[PDB]
Design a binder for this molecule. Sequence first.
Ligand SMILES: Cc1ccc(N2CC(N3CCC(C)(O)CC3)C2)cc1C(=O)NC1(c2ccc3c4c(cccc24)C(=O)N3C)CC1
Ligand SMILES: [Cl-]
Ligand SMILES: [Cl-]
Ligand SMILES: [Cl-]
Ligand SMILES: [Zn+2]
Ligand SMILES: [Zn+2]
Ligand SMILES: [Zn+2]
Length: 311
Amino acid sequence: TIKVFTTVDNINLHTQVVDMSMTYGQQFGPTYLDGADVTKIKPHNSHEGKTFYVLPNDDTLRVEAFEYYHTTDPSFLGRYMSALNHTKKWKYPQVNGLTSIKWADNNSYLATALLTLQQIELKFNPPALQDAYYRARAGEAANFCALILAYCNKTVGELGDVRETMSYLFQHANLDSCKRVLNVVCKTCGQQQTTLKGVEAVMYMGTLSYEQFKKGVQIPCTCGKQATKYLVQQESPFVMMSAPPAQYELKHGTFTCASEYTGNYQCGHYKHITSKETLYCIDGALLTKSSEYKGPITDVFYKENSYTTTI
Ligand SMILES: Cc1ccc(N2CC(N3CCC(C)(O)CC3)C2)cc1C(=O)NC1(c2ccc3c4c(cccc24)C(=O)N3C)CC1
Ligand SMILES: [Cl-]
Ligand SMILES: [Cl-]
Ligand SMILES: [Cl-]
Ligand SMILES: [Zn+2]
Ligand SMILES: [Zn+2]
Ligand SMILES: [Zn+2]
């Protein structure tokens, strides 16, 4: 036999002694080491003392798993480990003071998302995700990237939409204090206010321009007529404006960052535009810069705190 530790969170370790004749899966159930499924492997001698992730099979571990991940999903941990087996082999270069990702396993949309999250103000509710976010800012982003995949119900190599990913991530973040007040004006039905909170208060699909949203955008009413929707009041640390890819002018100092997308629906390539002393285009490990920009943009992020309209 040998002595090992099992865990669901890598915080609360539970001591174990494994008979070196039986496979870990005989003893503990599905078992993992640094993201690698060891369920059908028998204890080795170098394994001595190491920590093994297991699935939550008693109530103590179900509660420790909810406390760290905010999940009751019994599949969650295996989806995290499947992803980590890849993300731990990715490279995370520093590019322009930001943790990026060298291209692999179709991960351009995760790189763009990772770069964006470093430039906006966000607190994740699950500890596991907040801790991995901190460790990623500091350059070690494998666990964060694996957790993003698991929390978005996405696998390595699958094609991802940045806006869909940020939306899923926002739903696991503390945006509950965030508020948006809209006013719609239809010539038939009249004028009507609406208040949005949470993730709906920070995302809009339809235009890339925050200014345009403040000035008003044409939408359909329930009258079968086109009303105008404008922003009355915004209370959040950022807003995300999206629209189907299209050519768009970006000027330094007027936005925080943007998603550039080139190619066909679903199988194109994301790049990240960020506004610093000049405009930087971060493409995984590649960096380019330009004083001006015109290109195909599909999301733009803007800093906010409190905005109130002038009617
Ligand atoms: C990269 C990518 C990966 C995956 C997906 N999908 C999974 C989605 N699916 C998931 C779950 C759901 C069912 O709930 C909602 C739909 C669809 C989409 C894209 C993608 O290409 N997104 C962009 C884009 C390019 C060109 C576009 C558009 C259009 C509309 C919206 C986006 C878009 C549009 O009209 N054109 C001509 C932004 C780059
Ligand atoms: Cl929850
Ligand atoms: Cl959550
Ligand atoms: Cl194709
Ligand atoms: Zn708020
Ligand atoms: Zn109306
Ligand atoms: Zn570019």
